[PDB]
Design an enzyme around this catalytic site. Structure first.
Site, PDB file in Angstrom:
ATOM      1  CB  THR A   1     -27.335  64.932 -42.322  1.00 19.84           C
ATOM      2  OG1 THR A   1     -28.521  64.954 -42.019  1.00 19.84           O
ATOM      3  CG2 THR A   1     -26.876  65.873 -43.342  1.00 19.84           C
ATOM      4  CB  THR A   2     -24.484  61.675 -38.870  1.00 16.56           C
ATOM      5  OG1 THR A   2     -23.572  61.757 -39.703  1.00 16.56           O
ATOM      6  CG2 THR A   2     -24.458  60.525 -37.907  1.00 16.56           C
TER       7      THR A   2
END
Ligand SMILES: [Cl-]
Lengths: 243, 111, 241, 249, 244, 240, 234, 235, 231
Positions: free
Chosen positions: A30-31
């Protein structure tokens, strides 16, 4: 060939393919971002809501080191936790011997040397995380980003994960439009926006926003989580910008 | 030179009946000629209908009781919640005490 | 062909992992240069900051090992920092044990011996770096000693390292043929830095701004790195002649 | 943590020890070095192959002092040689001088070096040393002596020999010139002649490294007073001293 | 991990053989021949040096024959470096026995312990075996004169006359032909040299390509003497038997 | 330390290293054990490709573990010395703590335990050896004969053989040995042992070794002439 | 660690060190004691650590010889490793860290002196690991007798010949007035740019006078029970 | 090659699965549990007629109230039995009581997975552990080299296990007497055994609260074999 | 393929195959369900047997008076991890006189499982766990996976055909979360949830296994005739 089967083996290029393969695990995650501001730093992360059954606000990913350093990472979550556990031991022994809390650059190298050590032998695996971290010390605010190879640098803005390019582009604009500096409260709002904009690269499952910050004025130099009214204010700002 | 033992005074008393048993003990705790506490219990329910008291040097007494209470807990985990019989508890306590044969718990224990 | 994976001999008497560690040296695509003056030793290196989001002050391949010794690295930064930390520890321990500051050449030998161990022992990989140590030694004067992944080391009148190393090398060779001496006959270190930058410009064929370079200077009893403004001042002097 | 606790050098079906053979192949590639024994001394010599003309070849020493009366030279991998010299110097003290209060004789120091190189042939997680040494030395009861040491750990005494690049031709040249009545100066002369054949580029005191084991040197001792202490028999010839002998060549 | 690069030196083949031991024996078969002959009044040890060079220092050299103590000596066949490791161990073991019992070590006891060390390298440790075969020649007051041999497997056996190294098949046939039990040392000296002279890969057998030693009771009254032959002494014994 | 698991399972459920160790035993010289009414006899083969041997000093095939127990073997000779040494040490250790010499079953169980330990210990290979252990327990006149093998299993035998061509000599013993009536005397037991070896050996000269063990630590090895008399007697009766 | 040996030799001594113009000089007496008994009437207390670094030793005789040799051995290896002439501060640092580690149980009291590329140096080391710097120093049982002379006659800017005179005069004060010290005076001069000169038995003011009688016995005086030739050969 | 503690793509440990194949090659062992006791029986399987079958010890006492039968590489079971006996006696020393059959089995099964790169490989032997205690009464456990153990009313392990287990499925009921169980083990053993069943090549044993663990004599088992044949011919 | 020999190796796409093969062992395991309200937390587990003559493999383990878990996969690995949890809960009590937080329990398991996935020689744990507990911040339910990933949830399920029960709980979320001060109704909801993962077989008296912990309820396990109420 077979140069990519074992860790710490140079290929004919001069590359360690196992470390490059660990980067693929990071790119899959994920970012997460980091924003350096006037008198501190801000961290933010994308939490994918896999199911309605996930308890909101109760799967915290951002971690504190000592009382003045924040750490966030993308990739294999357990590997990140292991790295932070080491960071806490490093920070503890520094304060034990030298009294003062560990400086951010000093702390950055402690992690860097530890991660680099995991590219030296075939009996260990490289870390499957890029770690964004930083805080406030005697010399002011610092933001760092550490990679599986052990490579790290200081950053004005930092991003990693699946939506890193989108976030990097948005970060580059902030650096250009604010040469004199960005404030702490502003950076929290911007952090939210960039996560929402970076969510476009992971838009199947909806997500949950999580932000933290260190600031000499706003948090008195200590690491705190953004909660309640200040969090909702940042979400509303991000919602207004996407539409 | 450092002396690792102390005398916390007090006295305890156990009597057994036909279908019951009592374990009494005063609540005074002392060092030398001073009173530390007028109410500091030293007779404890350890579970499985076993009561215990380890009078003498209070630090060693507390450590022992604490360790026996824990022994009861792990006896349940390792043996399908079986009740620890009083005779089995007694033998277990012997091994706790003798374990420190060369640096003893300065206590008179009664269960 | 497992003889190419670990540090053991190949049929033709070669260590391929050591050879591939040499190729990792140029992975950063940076060229360095070192020269000696009368009273000083100057080392310069290219500084490339591609990403706009990077804090340029933290981007460095020059290290202050001790008060007197400085080190520039050609290779990846993780291995560079690994070597730097060890050199700092070794220099500090030397002073504590033997009562005087570790010489530049002695440190170079020590780091070279460590590098040699990685070429012989299997479990340890070689570091993909070339370490260039510089100082003004109290016995030997201005000094340049360079270490590589093979465990080889030697002193230098001057030297260069990187992708376009050969062009810089011959540029310096031709100068010392002409001058007929082992060093840069110059009083102040300021002009020795100007010489170093000038000859790198001629060899590489590129112009440099204040942020395109990184400079380290060794004098008697201290080694120090130059700021962007210190370099800018130095670039102005070259342009005005 | 090192988990290579097994031998990296093993016997092949044909009975060859592959890694030793390959180490000898590395020695073959290496620069030529030689040694000649005279009646009143020993000479060892080699070419200083410079990596770059900017490099100071004086700082890199191919000929090394091990004890005051023993010297060494090599052919093969320079870094491997360097650490062997370090280990050889230390073992001369720990396993001999600190016991008997005197420096070891040539043959025994050679034996200790061979033991170190043999262990790198059998021990876990290591390759053999990629060098062949020539060790010249003197001691009271054995006199002057010259030994060769190979990657396997084998050592042989020589009247004269050569190792490395052009060793085959150099050994043939020495067979013609060597006799049992050679004086030290004659042996130095022959050494320079032999070495010129293998050297291609410049041939002078700056590109050639040469040392001797000869008479005692009181002037090189550093002190006076003790009559029994008469100084080191090992002496490294200077750049100037070599060039003097190249004129009357 | 490291598993990938392990040769597995101490395992069995499908046929029930130890790969590394068999290959170490193959190595030894190319080494210079060494012969031991036991007589009633002494023992002979003869060995051929490996292709000698004219500039090799012959008189101050030791390649094949080594002294373990005053009563025991060994002839080597294989890697010299490996043999010296084992020789120093054997020398120490002999001195440990003397220190403990105030008596010189019996020959078999020394041989067994040295053979047990070799065995260990074939069963555990993951290391390569010692590429060496010994011929032990010694004396004690129990069994008198004794000849043994050990090889990389760690197996040892006793002999009246035996050869190790190169051309043992041809050498053993010749020894079996001319050997007899009531033999003297001087006769055994002649047999040892004649056998080498025929089995040698060289053109002609000369003094500079040989090592020689005897263990006699030729000293004064009931005591054993070890003679490691000098170059000139080999030159003389070679002429005396009519080989040169 | 060298840790590698050399003895491991294969898809079909076999430990090949243990099975390849049995092949080493099959290569070794033949050994036979026959127990009578009041004795046990251990017979052993010696290959005749080795002449110019010194039989005085050459290690004997049968080894004494204690004054009342003996051990013979087939397979790797070097390996057998390690088992014999360990067994001899354990024999003295038992006398020291129990104040009584080992039983034959106990000594067998110990040796078999060692062999087994080498089949699931890291860094080691199994012993390429099978043993025949024979003797008499303290203050007991009942003969004992046990066998061990590389895997670690052990068992008692009225008569048994191991080594090369052991399946031939086992075939011989299976029809010639009667459970209801074993060899009543020493001569009968030795003769049956020699007969069984003569099915395999070649010549009855210096190829056969015989060792007789009787109660109360009474062990003796036969000489060449003594064994040759049995060979001469059997061949004359055969021609019929 | 063993808390002293009484049997172990522990000589009385007078050792001194004096700095001068272009270097440093050290000196010592030559008496070795066993309790009140004089064991050696001409021992050498001046030791060589390196060619141009020398070491005078007092206290437990075995500890001073052993510690000076060990550090001297390591100094030689260090000199070969670094391709440099050894420094006095290196010997000083290695000695004190060794002695400190053993907490005084190694009873070595030393005056260290020498020249090196840095210059000329003079230090003293005590058994517990403390070091002192000075222009003039004295140890040993006769240190007070020697220091009295040094305090009376020492000045700044001494010449070579003046320093040798002052040093030997200080040793003489120990020889005559201290019972632990006696016999001869050894000296070692270490000047900058020159070889160090060791002057064994520089003064011999205590020569034994002619005996009044010869005690050579008539041959056969001692009663003998058995004679036998001993075999030293093989 | 490959690691010892490696997982297959299906999610099983290779070495554990391979050891189970070794156990299938082993001789048959059967166990039956009743309210009157637990019966254990094994196939001896002598490799040759000269081998004295009474020395084949495939049934073993752990304590007075716990017995054990084995199948597979029986040499591997020696250290397992040694551990079990020590665990049983040690527990009696610490707690002055008999140890639960389940707790004993758990202690043995903890050894199972203590292998890797500890011992070099898993055990190549399965165990039937039968016993009695005051709490859970008569019990029969099956202990594998996977570290897993199941309690069984009846269980067969070894080469003829799948055929014997199917037969135990039909024959077992909760009101079986001890005598009925003894005959049932002999009956099923005779069906799956290669050679003909007799007192010399098959062994019985049981554990009761009153008399503890007992291995039956060859004379006693012989009579039960004779009683079994007569009852089958009677209908 | 070439990158699944050991845990220390990454694949070209950045995957750890030995960890994924350990995850596969969980899918083969029998189904187990976890769910909680604000007052109580419940574990429901379908036990599995070898055959009709065998017992049913116990799935639920107690760690402390206020905490425990259910397992799915390699049972011996659950025994190791549950034993570690018992010690950590116990260390917290003896040293700090403090009941171990359920969140910290998860963090400790995560870090223990992780170390086995980064070193040569060892192997990943082959079991998934569902931890329930009641501490100072109310009821909790955790899901442990041997990759190291621990997740806090309102409800979940692991094992074979766990997707059926997980979908049901996702629909029923709003209902069962508010079952406060009523144990039997929360269990009923869990028993109905696990029933969505059944095929051919149904819940019998010696097949079902239930556990509960709450405000005034210690961690207790129900088996045998005690679960007959919920069929
Ligand atoms: Cl070093």
């Amino acid at each position: 060939t077979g140069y990519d089967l074992s860790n710490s083996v140079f290929s004919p290029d001069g590359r360690n393919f196992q470390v490059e393969y660990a980067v693929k695990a990071v790119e899959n995650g994920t970012t997460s971002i980091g924003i350096k501001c006037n008198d501190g730093v801000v961290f933010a992360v994308e939490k994918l809501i896999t199911s309605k059954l996930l308890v909101p606000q109760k799967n915290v990913k951002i971690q504190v080191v000592d009382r003045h350093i924040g750490c966030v990472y993308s990739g294999l979550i357990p590997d990140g936790r292991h790295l932070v556990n080491r960071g806490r031991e490093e920070a503890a022994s520094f304060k034990k011997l030298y009294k003062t809390p560990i400086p951010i650059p000093a702390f950055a190298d402690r992690l860097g040397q530890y991660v680099q050590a995991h590219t030296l032998y075939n009996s260990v695996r490289p870390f499957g995380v890029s770690t964004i971290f930083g805080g406030v010390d005697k010399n002011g605010a610092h933001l760092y980003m550490l990679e599986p190879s052990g490579s790290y640098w200081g950053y004005k803005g930092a991003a990693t994960g699946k939506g890193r390019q989108s976030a990097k582009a948005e970060l580059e604009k902030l650096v250009d439009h604010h040469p004199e500096g960005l404030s702490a409260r502003e950076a929290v709002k911007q952090a939210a926006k960039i996560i929402y904009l970076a969510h476009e690269d992971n838009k199947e499952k909806d997500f949950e926003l999580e932000i933290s910050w260190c600031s000499l004025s706003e948090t008195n130099g200590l690491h705190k989580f953004v909660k309640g009214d200040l969090l909702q204010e940042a979400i509303d700002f991000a919602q207004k910008e996407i539409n | 030179q450092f002396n690792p033992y102390g005398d916390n005074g007090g006295t305890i008393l156990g009597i057994a009946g036909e279908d019951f048993a009592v374990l009494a003990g005063d609540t005074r705790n002392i060092t030398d000629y001073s009173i530390n506490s007028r109410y500091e219990p030293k007779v404890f329910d350890c579970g499985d209908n076993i009561v215990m008291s380890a009078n003498g040097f209070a630090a060693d007494g507390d450590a022992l009781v604490k360790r026996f209470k824990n022994s009861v807990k792990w006896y349940h985990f390792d043996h399908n919640d079986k009740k620890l019989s009083i005779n089995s508890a007694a033998r277990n306590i012997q091994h706790l005490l003798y374990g420190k044969r060369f640096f003893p718990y300065y206590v008179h224990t009664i269960i | 062909g497992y003889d190419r994976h670990i540090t053991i001999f190949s049929p033709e008497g070669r260590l391929y992992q050591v050879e591939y560690a040499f190729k990792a040296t140029n992975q950063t695509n940076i060229n360095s240069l070192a020269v000696r003056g009368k009273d000083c030793t100057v080392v310069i290196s290219q500084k490339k900051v591609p990403d706009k989001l990077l804090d340029p002050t933290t981007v460095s391949y020059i290290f202050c090992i001790s008060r007197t010794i400085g080190m520039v690295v050609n290779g990846p930064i993780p291995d560079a920092r690994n070597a730097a930390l060890r050199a700092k520890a070794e220099a500090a321990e030397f002073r504590y044990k033997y009562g005087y500051d570790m010489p530049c050449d002695v440190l170079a030998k020590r780091m070279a011996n460590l590098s040699q161990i990685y070429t012989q022992r299997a479990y340890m990989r070689p570091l993909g770096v070339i370490l260039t140590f510089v100082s003004v030694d109290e016995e030997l004067g201005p000094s340049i000693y360079k270490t590589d992944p093979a465990g080889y080391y030697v002193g230098y009148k001057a030297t260069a390292t990187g992708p376009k190393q050969q062009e810089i090398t011959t540029n310096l060779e031709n100068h010392f043929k002409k001058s007929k001496i082992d060093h840069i006959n110059e009083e102040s270190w300021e002009k020795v830095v100007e010489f170093a930058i000038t000859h790198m410009i001629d060899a590489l064929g590129t112009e440099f701004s204040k942020n395109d370079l990184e400079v380290g200077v060794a004098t008697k009893d201290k080694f120090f790195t130059l700021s962007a403004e210190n370099i800018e001042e130095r670039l102005v002097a070259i342009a005005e002649q | 943590t090192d988990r290579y606790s097994f031998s990296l050098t093993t016997f092949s079906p044909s009975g060859k020890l592959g890694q030793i053979d390959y180490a000898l192949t590395a020695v073959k590639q290496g620069v030529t070095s030689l040694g000649i024994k005279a009646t009143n001394g020993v000479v060892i010599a080699t070419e200083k192959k410079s990596s770059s003309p900017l490099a100071m070849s004086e700082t890199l020493s191919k000929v090394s002092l091990l004890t005051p009366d023993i010297g060494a030279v090599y052919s093969g991998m320079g870094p491997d040689y360097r650490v062997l010299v370090d280990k050889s110097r230390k073992v001369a003290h720990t396993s001999y001088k600190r016991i008997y209060g005197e420096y070891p004789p040539t043959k025994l120091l050679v034996s200790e070096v061979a033991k170190i190189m043999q262990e790198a042939t059998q021990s876990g997680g290591v390759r053999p040393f990629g060098v062949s040494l020539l060790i010249a030395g003197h001691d009271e009861f054995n006199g002057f002596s010259l030994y060769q040491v190979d990657p396997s750990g084998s050592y042989f005494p020589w009247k004269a020999t050569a190792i490395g690049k052009g060793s085959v031709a150099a050994k043939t040249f020495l067979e013609k010139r060597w006799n049992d009545e050679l004086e030290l100066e004659d042996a130095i002369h022959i050494a320079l002649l032999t070495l010129k054949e293998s050297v291609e580029g410049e041939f002078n005191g700056d590109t050639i490294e040469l040392a001797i084991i000869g008479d005692e040197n009181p002037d090189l001792l550093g002190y006076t007073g003790i009559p029994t202490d008469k100084g080191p028999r090992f002496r490294k010839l200077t750049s100037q001293e070599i060039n003097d002998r190249l004129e009357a060549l | 991990g490291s598993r990938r690069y392990d040769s597995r030196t101490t395992i069995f083949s499908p046929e029930g053989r130890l790969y590394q031991v068999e290959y170490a024996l193959e190595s030894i078969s190319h080494a210079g021949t060494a012969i031991g002959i036991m007589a009633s009044d002494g023992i002979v040890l003869a060995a051929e040096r490996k292709v000698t060079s004219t500039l090799l220092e012959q008189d101050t050299s030791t390649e094949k024959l080594y002294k373990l103590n005053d009563k025991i000596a060994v002839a080597v066949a294989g890697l010299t470096a490996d043999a010296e490791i084992l020789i120093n161990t054997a020398r120490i073991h002999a001195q440990n026995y003397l220190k403990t019992y105030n008596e010189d070590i019996p020959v078999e006891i020394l041989v067994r312990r040295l053979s047990d060390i070799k065995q260990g390298y074939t069963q555990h440790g993951g290391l390569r075996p010692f590429g060496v075969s010994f011929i032990y020649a010694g004396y004690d007051d129990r069994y008198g004169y004794q000849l043994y041999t050990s090889n990389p497997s760690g197996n040892y056996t006793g002999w009246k006359a035996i050869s190790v190294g190169a051309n043992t098949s041809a050498a053993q046939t010749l020894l079996q032909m001319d050997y007899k039990d009531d033999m003297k040392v001087d006769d055994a000296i002649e047999l040892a040299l004649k056998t080498l002279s025929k089995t040698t890969d060289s053109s002609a057998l000369t003094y500079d390509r040989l090592e020689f030693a005897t263990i006699r009771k030729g000293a004064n009254d009931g005591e054993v003497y070890q003679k490691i032959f000098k170059p000139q002494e080999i030159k003389d014994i070679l002429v005396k038997t009519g080989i040169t | 330390g060298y840790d590698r698991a050399l003895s491991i399972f294969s898809p079909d459920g076999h430990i090949f290293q243990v099975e390849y160790a049995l092949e080493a035993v099959k290569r070794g010289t033949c050994a036979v054990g026959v127990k009578g009414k009041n004795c046990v006899v251990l017979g052993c083969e010696r290959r005749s490709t080795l002449k110019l041997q010194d039989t005085r000093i050459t290690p004997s095939k049968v080894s004494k573990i204690d004054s009342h127990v003996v051990l013979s073997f087939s397979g790797l000779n070097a390996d057998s010395r390690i088992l014999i040494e360990k067994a001899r040490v354990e024999a003295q250790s038992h006398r020291l703590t129990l104040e009584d010499p080992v039983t034959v079953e106990y000594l067998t169980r110990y040796v078999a335990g060692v062999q087994q330990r080498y089949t699931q210990s890291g860094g080691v290979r199994p012993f390429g050896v099978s043993t025949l252990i024979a003797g008499f327990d303290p203050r007991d006149d009942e003969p004992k004969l046990y066998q061990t093998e590389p895997s670690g299993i052990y068992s008692s035998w009225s008569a048994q053989t191991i080594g090369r061509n052991s399946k031939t000599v086992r075939e011989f013993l299976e029809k010639n040995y009667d459970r209801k009536e074993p060899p009543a005397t020493v001569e009968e037991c030795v003769k049956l042992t020699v007969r069984s070896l003569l099915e395999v050996v070649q010549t009855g000269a210096k190829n056969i070794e015989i060792t007789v063990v009787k109660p109360d630590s009474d062990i003796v090895a036969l000489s060449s002439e003594e064994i040759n008399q049995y060979v001469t007697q059997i061949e004359q009766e055969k021609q019929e | 660690n063993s808390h002293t040996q009484p049997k172990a030799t522990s000589t009385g001594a007078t050792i001194v060190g004096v700095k001068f113009n272009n270097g440093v000089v050290i000196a010592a007496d030559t008496r070795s004691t066993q309790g009140p008994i004089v064991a050696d009437k001409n021992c050498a207390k001046l030791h060589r650590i390196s060619p141009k670094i020398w070491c005078a030793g007092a206290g437990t005789a075995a500890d001073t010889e052993a510690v000076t040799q060990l550090i001297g051995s390591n100094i030689e290896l260090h000199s070969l490793y670094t391709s440099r002439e050894p420094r006095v501060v290196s010997a000083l640092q290695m000695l004190k860290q060794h002695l400190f580690k053993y907490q005084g149980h190694i009873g070595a009291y030393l005056i260290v002196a020498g020249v090196d590329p840095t210059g000329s140096h003079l230090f003293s080391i005590h058994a517990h690991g403390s070091t002192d710097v000075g222009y003039y120093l004295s140890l040993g049982s006769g240190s007070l007798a020697a220091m009295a002379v040094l305090e009376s006659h020492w000045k700044q800017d001494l010449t070579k010949e003046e320093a040798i005179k002052l040093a030997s005069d200080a040793i003489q004060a120990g020889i005559w007035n201290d019972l632990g010290s006696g016999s001869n005076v050894d000296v070692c001069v270490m000047e900058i740019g020159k070889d160090a000169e060791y002057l064994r038995n520089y003064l011999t003011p205590n020569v034994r006078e002619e005996k009044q009688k010869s005690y050579k016995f008539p041959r056969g005086t001692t009663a003998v029970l058995k004679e036998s030739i001993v075999n030293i050969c093989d | 090659d490959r690691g010892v503690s490696t997982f297959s793509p299906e999610g099983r440990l290779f070495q554990v699965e391979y050891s189970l194949e070794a156990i299938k090659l082993g001789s048959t062992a059967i166990g039956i549990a009743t309210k009157e006791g637990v019966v254990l029986g094994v196939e001896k399987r002598a490799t040759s007629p000269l081998l004295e079958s009474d020395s084949i010890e495939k049934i073993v006492e752990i304590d007075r109230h716990i017995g054990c039968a084995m199948s597979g590489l029986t040499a591997d079971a020696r250290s397992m039995i040694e551990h079990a006996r020590t665990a049983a006696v040690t527990h009696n020393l610490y707690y002055d009581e008999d140890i639960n059959v389940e707790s004993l089995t758990q202690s043995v099964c903890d050894l199972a997975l203590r292998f890797g790169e500890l011992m070099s490989r898993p055990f190549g032997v399965a165990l039937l552990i039968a016993g009695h205690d005051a709490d859970d009464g008569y019990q029969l456990f099956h202990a594998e080299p996977s570290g897993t153990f199941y309690r069984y009313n009846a269980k067969a392990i070894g080469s003829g296990s799948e055929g014997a287990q199917a037969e135990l499925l039909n024959e077992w009921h909760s009101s079986l007497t001890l005598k009925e169980a003894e005959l049932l083990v002999l009956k099923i053993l005779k069906q799956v055994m290669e050679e003909k069943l007799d007192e010399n090549n098959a062994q019985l044993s049981c554990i009761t609260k009153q008399d503890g663990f007992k291995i039956y004599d060859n004379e006693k088992t012989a009579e039960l074999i004779k009683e079994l044949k007569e009852k089958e011919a009677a209908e | 393929n070439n990158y699944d020999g050991d845990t220390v190796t990454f694949s070209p796409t950045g995957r750890l195959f030995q960890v994924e093969y350990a995850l596969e062992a969980i899918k083969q395991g029998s189904v187990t369900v976890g769910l909680r309200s604000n007052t109580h937390a419940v574990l429901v587990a379908l036990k599995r047997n070898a055959d009709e003559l065998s017992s049913y493999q116990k799935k639920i383990i107690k760690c402390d008076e206020h905490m425990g878990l259910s397992l799915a996969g390699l049972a011996p690995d659950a025994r190791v991890l549950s034993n570690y949890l018992r010690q950590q809960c116990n260390y917290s009590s003896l040293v700090f006189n403090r009941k171990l937080a359920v969140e910290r329990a998860g963090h400790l398991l995560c870090d223990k499982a992780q170390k086995n996935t980064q070193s040569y020689g060892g192997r990943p744990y082959g079991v998934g766990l569902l931890i329930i507990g009641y501490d100072k911040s109310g009821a909790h339910l955790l899901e442990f996976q041997p990759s190291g990933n621990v997740t806090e949830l309102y409800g979940t399920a692991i094992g074979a055909r766990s997707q059926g029960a997980k979908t049901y709980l996702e629909r029923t979320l709003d209902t069962f979360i508010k079952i406060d001060g009523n144990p039997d109704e929360l269990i009923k909801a869990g028993v109905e949830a696990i029933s969505q993962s059944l095929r051919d077989e149904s819940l019998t008296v010696d097949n079902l296994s239930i556990a509960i912990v709450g405000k005034d309820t210690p961690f207790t396990i129900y088996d045998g005739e005690a679960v007959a109420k919920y069929i």
